[PDB]
Paper text:
NoVs are encapsulated by a protein capsid that is assembled by a single major structural protein, the capsid protein VP1. VP1 is divided into the N-terminal shell (S) and the C-terminal protruding (P) domain, forming the interior shell and the multiple protrusions of the capsid, respectively. HuNoVs interact with histo-blood group antigens (HBGAs) in a strain-specific manner. In this study, through X-ray crystallography of the P domain of a GII.21 huNoV (OIF) we identified a unique lineage in GII consisting of GII.13 and GII.21 genotypes that recognize HBGAs through a binding interface distinct from the GII conventional binding interface.
The crystal of the native P domain protein belongs to the P21 space group, with two monomers forming a dimer in an asymmetric unit. The final refined structure of native P domain includes residues 223 to 527, with the exception of a loop region comprising residues 340~342 due to the lack of recognizable electron density. The two monomers of the OIF P dimer are related by a non-crystallographic two-fold axis, which forms the biologically active protrusion of the NoV capsid. The P dimer has a dimension of 55 Å×64 Å×70 Å with an extensively buried interface of 3,500 Å2 between two protomers, including hydrophobic and hydrophilic interacting residues from both P1 and P2 subdomains. The P-loop of the OIF P dimer exhibits a unique conformation, taking a ~90° flip, which results in its extruding out of the flat surface and approaching the opposite protomer. As a result, the majority of the S-loop is covered in the OIF virus. Such structural rearrangements destroy the structural integrity of the conventional GII HBGA binding interfaces that are formed mainly by P- and S-loops. On the other hand, the B- and the T-loops also exhibit unique conformations, approaching to each other in closer proximity with the N-loop. This special structural feature allows the formation of new HBGA binding interface (see below), formed by the B-, T- and N-loops, a scenario that is absent in all other known GII huNoV structures. Analysis of the native OIF P domain structure revealed that a glycerol molecule occupies the HBGA binding pocket, which was clearly visible from the 2Fo-Fc omit map. The glycerol molecule is held firmly inside the HBGA binding pocket by eight direct hydrogen bonds between the hydroxyl groups of the glycerol and the side chains of N392, N394 and T395 from the T-loop, T356 and the main chain of S357 from the N-loop. Interestingly, the glycerol molecule resembles partial structures (C2, C3, and C4 with their hydroxyl groups) of the β-Gal that contributes the vast majority of the interactions with the binding pocket (Compare Fig 5F with Fig 7C), thus explaining the observed interactions.
Author numbering:
A (entry chain B): 221 to 527
B (entry chain A): 222 to 527
The structure:
């Protein structure tokens, strides 16, 4: 008995980004000529193998948990956070992982709120500090078990069990948001380890199709766009189903149930990403009620209908 | 007939459906004299969502819309004119208690409001800490508006805004009451379209909850939020839509390595679990275990005691 492969039935307004906790807003395609596309969150094979720093919960993506240090006396990261995995499991740096699960996989400033010991303090927001976690910081060393926290609203308490809840991205004069550049998980000038592989098209006329979110920008005017290979719900679905991949390429179609007609077709690669026959950098427009659907296994030679 | 199933997810692989946080514990209580009628995390076993329940973790206790002009109110300095979290237009005539994901407790929800992106040398320029009290007279989400009380930074008027939840606050006059519903239209108007109240209706049984210890941002006590089924079960039932064969699915919490059943429970068609137990306490489970569907049983099926 061979279990058939399937996608969940979810419209674009029913999908979550697997690289930042936000709904999908757009589908987007680009040749990405001058970058290497190698995200570490939102990585799952079609047969259900999680890779990189990928885990199952939306709440763990770009989240951190652990114990704060004593003050560092550093100009930027006034405290460190000694990490456990988001599920609370002890983190062993010798694990065959790039970093704890859910660690941010871009170079940029992640903004969110650190919460620590409940306080009898009579102040509003007493136990909620706004913090910047820059993955260009010299103290961003999650592979080693520690990251730097730069407080921006309130004061971080030393030596307390703490949770970081992500909210958005900040950009400053020396820290552009670079979604396709990985952090150096062990610190400046070190080599990343245990990475999910880079992805790209391998058929003439094809480009990757991404699930895109415009996430909150808390400093700077540039809209912050984060592209994932598959949405978090697909990670969860493939993990659950673990259907055997019967070829290297699944043919999927985007259907409009209002008309019963498909809008476009695409290849969903066994590695866990989508390509389409398209050129240029632009959104791919879909009807709000439409959804992706698995139609059949095909092979590397299947020529897609162009968009 | 399509077989009913539960997803294979351990306790550390589950999300609270009433607040965006991982499940920390299973927990049981008699909840004496208290009506348990949450509106998030509500889904029947054949995949019908109820109350304000929707599918995304990111929409739970989140809000989206346009801020008003300054109100000059003592507490809610701005209103937020709501759409649903997915951006779909909301209107009060929808057959829902309130926009999807609206908080379903009486208390202060703390989080961050983000608005128009703008170039600035100021850190956190476009991220304001805000309290959304569901006990406020301005908390009328069924009518399309809620009140925002700023606590960190200044809210901008007339801007498209998103609220990202972070935790719960207890201030001088707002105890947290997880089982008391907002008056979604204000106290003078009845709530509508509610997912039904749940309870054991069986001597010696209690509800088993999926519990999260969520961030407590003001007040010295920890805050616990209990849901009837985790968000992943809502998602699973919605997709599968397996027809129910009775009112009660017998389920067993199993350890897949030892092969042992830890306990059995009744998963009710309405979308909640009961166990044969008395008292208020955690229900301890192996970290590698999970509920497994056993069989559909009679609506009056009796359980082995915990």
């Amino acid at each position: 008995k061979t279990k058939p492969f399937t996608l969940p039935i979810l419209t674009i307004g029913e999908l979550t980004n697997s690289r930042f906790p936000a709904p999908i807003d757009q589908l987007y395609t680009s040749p990405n000529a001058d970058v290497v596309v190698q995200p570490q969150n939102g990585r799952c094979s079609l047969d259900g193998e999680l890779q990189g720093t990928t885990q199952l919960l939306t709440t763990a993506i770009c989240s951190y948990r652990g114990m704060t240090s004593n003050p560092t006396r550093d100009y930027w990261d006034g405290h460190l956070l000694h990490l456990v995995h988001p599920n609370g499991a002890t983190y062993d740096p010798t694990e065959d992982v790039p970093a704890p699960f859910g660690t941010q996989d871009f170079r940029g400033i992640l903004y969110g709120v650190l919460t620590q010991n409940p306080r009898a303090s009579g102040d509003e927001a007493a136990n909620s500090q706004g913090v910047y976690i820059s993955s260009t910081s010299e103290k961003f060393t999650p592979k080693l078990g520690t990251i730097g926290l730069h407080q921006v609203q309130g004061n971080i308490a030393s030596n307390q069990q703490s949770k970081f809840t992500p909210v958005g991205i900040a950009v400053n004069g020396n820290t552009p948001f670079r979604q396709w550049e990985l952090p150096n998980y062990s610190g400046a000038l070190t080599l990343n380890t245990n990475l999910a592989p880079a992805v790209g098209p391998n058929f003439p006329g094809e480009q990757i199709l991404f699930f895109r979110s415009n996430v909150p920008s808390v400093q700077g005017g540039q809209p912050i766009e984060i592209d994932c290979l598959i949405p978090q719900e697909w990670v969860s679905h493939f993990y659950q189903e673990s259907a055997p991949s019967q070829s290297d390429v699944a043919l999927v179609r985007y259907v409009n149930p209002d008309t019963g007609r498909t809008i476009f077709e695409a290849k969903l690669h066994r590695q866990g990403f989508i390509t389409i026959a398209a050129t240029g950098s632009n959104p791919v427009v879909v009807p709000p009620n439409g959804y992706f659907r698995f139609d059949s296994w095909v092979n590397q030679f299947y020529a897609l209908a162009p968009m």
